Amino acid sequence: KFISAEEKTGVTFDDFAGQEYIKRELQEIVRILKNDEEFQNKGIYCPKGVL
Amino acid sequence: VQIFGVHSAGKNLAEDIDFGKLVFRTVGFSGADIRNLVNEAAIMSVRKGRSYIYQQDIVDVLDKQLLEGMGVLLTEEEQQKCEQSVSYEKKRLLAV
């Protein structure tokens, strides 16, 4: 009973900078996961694990 | 080519799509690699807002995969500013 199911941390994308390519690439994955229907209509699937 | 056709059937490929001219870029690829290539082509075609997948889409996907190998993760503006950072005398030597 230790894993934090945290809904909000207070750290946004604007705080982490200098690696905008990685930020945009993670934005694509996050937007794919949130918008799975619209992008899955064209057959796009998100990866299960990002390291 | 047959694996690409199997794994890229249910997508809106454009009239300039032909995998026969990109075979040499996929030497050693398995079925999963070609499937990931098709998926990334769909992602990149969505990225520019393009409705179909162009040949330039797959070319740029392969080029991005190749440029990511040596540790260069740069956008267009940073690449252009860094190209403008160097001088002209030391660029003609590399050109020659």
- Give dist(CA A13, CA A3) in Å, integer: 23
For residue B10, the chain A residues in CB contact (below 8 A) are 43
Select from A21, A44, A45 the Cβ nearest to the Cβ of B46: A44
List residues bridging with B53 in a β-sheet: B13
* Nearest CA distance, B87 vs chain A (angstrom): 25
Report the candidate in A46, A23, A30 with the shortest Cα–Cα distance to residue B43.
Answer: A46
The token pair at B10 is 């249910």
Distances (CA, A) of B4 to B13, B23, B84, B90: 12, 10, 39, 43
| Helices and strands, number each (H, E), in chain A | 2, 0
Question: Could you tell me the resolution of this structure in angstroms?
Answer: 3.2
* Nearest CA distance, A13 vs chain B (angstrom): 17
- Give dist(CA A47, CA A17) in Å, integer: 24
> What are the residues of chain B with a beta carbon less than 8 Å away from any beta carbon of chain A?
10-12, 39, 42-43, 46-47, 73-75
Flag if A43 and B47 touch (Cβ within 8 Å): no
Name the experiment that determined this structure: cryo-EM
Flag if A28 and B43 touch (Cβ within 8 Å): yes
Distances (CA, A) of B82 to A42, B47, B64, B65, B73: 36, 24, 18, 21, 13
Distances (CA, A) of A34 to A28, A38, A47, A48: 10, 10, 13, 14
Residues 6+ apart with CB under 8 A from B92: none
The token pair at B42 is 């769909």
- Give dist(CA B96, CA B87) in Å, integer: 15
Give the DSSP H or E segment for B55.
helix B55-67
